[PDB]
Structure 1
Amino acid sequence: IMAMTMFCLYKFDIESEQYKEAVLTMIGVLSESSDGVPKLTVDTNNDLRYLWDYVTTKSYISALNWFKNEFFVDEWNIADVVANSDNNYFTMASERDVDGTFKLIELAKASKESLKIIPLGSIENLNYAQEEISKSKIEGGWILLQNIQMSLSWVKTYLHKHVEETKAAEEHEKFKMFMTCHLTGDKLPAPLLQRTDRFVYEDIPGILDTVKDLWGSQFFTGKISGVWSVYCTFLLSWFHALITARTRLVPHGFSKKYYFNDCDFQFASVYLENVLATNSTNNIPWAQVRDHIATIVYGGKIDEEKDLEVVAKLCAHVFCGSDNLQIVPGVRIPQPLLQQSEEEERARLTAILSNTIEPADSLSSWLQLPRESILNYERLQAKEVASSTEQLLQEM
């Protein structure tokens, strides 16, 4: 929105009047205000002639990013921003789908180390927290305050005064405090917010990448279950990464934004350990595995009947499957071999991830929803950016 706006804020004063109505009749096409073909002159404008080519090719995401490239700016990486920034405080909000907690780990590792993750949980965590805060500034270590919004009542009393009083934090050793927020969620005090630097973690992982990230930790748990189980834990890895991928695509996709957690995976895997623990190793237990995953574990938060069918139809494909599953078009998962090596099978199932590379059309090929729905969605988020910019121009 700020791209398209600032582009028109510059070029309307700088370029021709014929330029003005041409680009505006284009921004009108991206929005549902109007549809037209702009005024066309041989060699008259070439950058503008290149833009309409994006809009006429029904390619929406491309035409929206056009205005970003036209700024000719290095779009600053949270690291660069932090490095430039000259304050010991930062609040980075983000959507509930992701958390930049793990981005901060690699940000600290690559420069200055000193990573300290601090959950604000109960009295103990806030109480330990306030102790680790006063000591880290003297030490100069980095600190993170995970999900403050929940512990907020405390913020207005202890943190609001504490951060305000600490003008000696400038005097104190190189130290940097970070706080994670959620944009959809409890509203932070404005005065504390204005004092502290702000970032939005907008970095969304691909399906395959999230599968690899789910499966990655799973080896840390040890070994307590069958070799066969690791196959079901692999199945769930794909499943969870497939519904999370669907969560963002709405309305086309899911009816509302639903949030699914690492808690949802945990409650699902717990049920899986339990079904394999209470049944024989025969594959056929599969029937009530789907029902319980699709209606209690994940279908719990779902309230709309439309969407409850979608979670079920995902379980239909991810869980029931004899000999070959074929989660995605390219990748087939075969059921455990007779050799029954549990160490081999981990490595085999990791290898199947390393073999595949996520296609261009992933959201339509992998999430079995149609291509025409994805375009419908691309069109709508285009319309939202284009609208809000026109609104902004006329307001000033």
Structure 2
Amino acid sequence: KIFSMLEKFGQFHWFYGISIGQFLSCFKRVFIKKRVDEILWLLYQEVYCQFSTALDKKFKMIMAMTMFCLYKFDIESEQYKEAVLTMIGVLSESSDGVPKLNDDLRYLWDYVTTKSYISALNWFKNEFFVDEWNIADVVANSENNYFTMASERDVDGTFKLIELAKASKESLKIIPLGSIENLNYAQEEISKSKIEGGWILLQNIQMSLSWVKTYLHKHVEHEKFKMFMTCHLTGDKLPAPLLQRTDRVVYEDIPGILDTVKDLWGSQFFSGVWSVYCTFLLSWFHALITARTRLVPHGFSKKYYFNDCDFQFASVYLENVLATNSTNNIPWAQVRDHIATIVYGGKIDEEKDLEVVAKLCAHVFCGSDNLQIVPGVRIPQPLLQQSEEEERARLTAILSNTIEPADSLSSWLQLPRESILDYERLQAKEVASSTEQLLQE
């Protein structure tokens, strides 16, 4: 039954294709780690802890809930079967009625009544699947040497692999592509690391999929050698023989906003006080728009992808504006228009997204006497007797002391709570419908 469910997952998307030798090796790991009920529980726990990290968050929740449902359907009675079925139905708003009356089931009904859909979905992992796996646990408990780390856009695993290499004290080599010189350098580095070992990083190989078809099929036990390649979940299809011979890892984008601001401002290494203040505001706005990007049903209407390139171009534009102004009168309207209708609206092909981006620009680049960028904290205007280092210290201090609230997706992005609750309800409906399609078939 578990293998049938995983075959369905592999049929849903081209990245989830699960082999059979992997399943048998996971079953071997069940006994390796340290009566029939205990063996079955260890089977379920080990299979989830091995095959969760090869899926995205939505399919993670789907597989967790389906595994809990199958275990409770086989172990518990018919009343709990009907209760679980009707809770899954009311999650998708298909079956209406209270479950038959269990402390944990009462907690589920309390969470459903309070419309906390993400907590209801994560309750299964909170209750049954106690153990969790990160990227380090996957790479440490893997016998292979070739790894694929795919993810969505608006995020990258370069810093995560940097942290992993620092943790393992291994010299990593990030190899960007784009030129035949880059391809030759990557080939030479591969031919070197196939002898002397070492961790080698490959990034955004979907554009070089043709080079993959040319070289990797013909190419594919050294110590401290693990080849990493990064793909995109929305990209082109990778070859199946390449995918079956490697371990698959999916990374999740961070949910915070202040962390993004800190990460952006920690790389803007320097133009005096005004340039630094402009770069600070630009980092805040890039973080806010990147946070609003993922909210596809309500905040936006289409999943755009604002990388750091448009932030860099906006920084260049602000530098050029600040250079040609000796009167200390910043043209707020000009920079607002250029950000709204060229920089962060050039790729936009819809009117409503342009209007909301312009509204956010007016909210951020107003240049008021005392701006309230978020309801939590207010950034005062700089004074007229400061150098660059004093302003940098002041901005870092005013960045550190801020508190990220639990409603950052509503208060900081200026959205009604009903929209976010509707988005979460739609996600719950999708998860429940998918797990029903897994159940009845």
Range into which the TM-score falls when normalised by the shorter chain: over 0.9
Deviations 1:37-69 (A, max 9, x none): 1112xxxx3322221111111111000011112
SS at match of 1:388: helix
Q: CA deviation at 1:174?
A: 2.9
Q: Is structure 2 residue 74 aligned with structure 1 residue 13?
A: yes
Secondary structure, in 3 states, of the residue corresponding to 1:184?
coil
The structural deviation recorded for 1:95 is: 0.6
Report how far residue 15 of structure 1 moved.
0.4
Q: CA deviation at 1:160?
A: 2.0
Cα distance between partner residues in 1 of 2:292 and 2:279:
20
> 2:288–2:413: 8 Å Cα contact kept in structure 1?
yes
Q: CA deviation at 1:281?
A: 4.5
User: Secondary structure, in 3 states, of the residue corresponding to 1:199?
Assistant: strand
Q: Give the Cα separation in 2 of the matches to 1:250 and 1:162.
A: 40
1-side partners of 2:146 and 2:256: how far apart?
31
Q: Is the 8 A contact 1:92 1:181 kept in 2?
A: yes
**Which position in structure 2 is the counterpart of 1:128?**
185
Deviation for aligned residue 1:118 = 0.8
Contact 1:242 1:367 (8 Å CA) reproduced: yes
Residues 187-230 of structure 1: CA distance to partner in whole angstroms, max 9, x if unpaired? Answer: 1111101111000011414111100111111015xxxx232111
SS in 2 for 1:116: strand
TM-score, with structure 2 as normaliser: 0.84
Unaligned runs of 5+ in 2: 1-61
Distance 1:376 1:205, change over 3 A: closer
- 1:278 Cα offset (Å): 2.0
Q: Distance in 1 between matches of 2:285 and 2:329?
A: 18
Counterpart CA distance in 2 for 1:280 and 1:23 is 69
Task: Judge conservation of contact 1:138–1:173 (CA < 8 Å) in 2.
Answer: no
Give the 5 Å matches for 1:62-81.
62-81=119-138
* Misfit runs of 4+, over 3 Å: none
**Residue 276 of structure 2 corresponds to residue 213 of structure 1:** no
Shift of residue 19, structure 1, vs aligned partner: 0.5
SS of the residue 2:212 aligns to: helix
Deviations 1:96-120 (A, max 9, x none): 0101110010111011422111112
The CA deviation at 1:336 is 1.6
Q: Deviations over 1:227-266 (max 9, x none)?
A: 2111010000100000000011121111111110100101
- Measure, in 2, the Cα distance between the counterparts of 1:76 and 1:188: 25
3-state DSSP of counterpart to 2:414: coil
Aligned to 1:101: 158
- Identity over aligned pairs, percent: 99
Q: Is the 8 A contact 1:137 1:173 kept in 2?
A: no
Q: Structure 1's 10 and 281: CA in aligned 2 closer, same or farther, altered over 3 A?
A: farther
**1:384 shift after superposition:** 1.0
Which consecutive residues of structure 1, in runs of 5 or more, have no partner in the other structure?
Answer: 164-170
Describe the SS at the equivalent of 1:200. Answer: strand
- TM-aligned CA deviation for residue 321 of structure 1: 2.0
Contact 1:94 1:201 in 2 (8 A): yes
Name the CA distance, whole Å, in 2 between partners of 1:288 and 1:160: 53
Count of paired positions: 380
Q: 1:30–1:382: 8 Å Cα contact kept in structure 2?
A: yes
TM-score in terms of structure 1 length: 0.94
Q: Partners of 1:267 and 1:363 in 2: how far apart?
A: 26
Shift of residue 320, structure 1, vs aligned partner? 1.3
Distance in 1 (CA, whole Å) between partners of 2:359 and 2:65 is 40
Q: Deviations over 1:128-181 (max 9, x none)?
A: 000001102322210000110111100011122112xxxxxxx33330000001
Q: Distance in 2 between matches of 1:107 and 1:180?
A: 15
SS at match of 1:376: helix
Aligned to 2:242: 192
Which SS does the other structure have where 2:318 is aligned? helix
Higher mean alpha-carbon deviation, 68-77 vs 48-57, is at 68-77
**Match in the other structure for 2:400:** 354
C-alpha contact 2:275 2:319 (8 A) present in aligned 1 = yes
Q: Could you tell me how far apart the structure 2 residues matched to 1:139 and 1:323 are?
A: 60
1:277 aligns with 2:334: no
Q: 256-265 or 62-71, which moves further after superposition?
A: 62-71
Q: 1:322, CA displacement in angstroms?
A: 2.0
Q: For 2:379, what is the secondary structure of its paired residue?
A: coil
Please give the secondary structure, in 1, of the residue aligned with 2:133. Answer: coil
Distance 1:372-1:283 versus aligned 2 partners, 3 A rule: farther
Check the 8 A contact 2:217/2:242 in 1, yes or no.
yes
Contact 2:150 2:233 in 1 (8 A): yes
C-alpha separation between the residues in 2 aligned to 1:74 and 1:267? 44
**Residue range with higher mean Cα deviation, 48-57 or 16-25:** 48-57
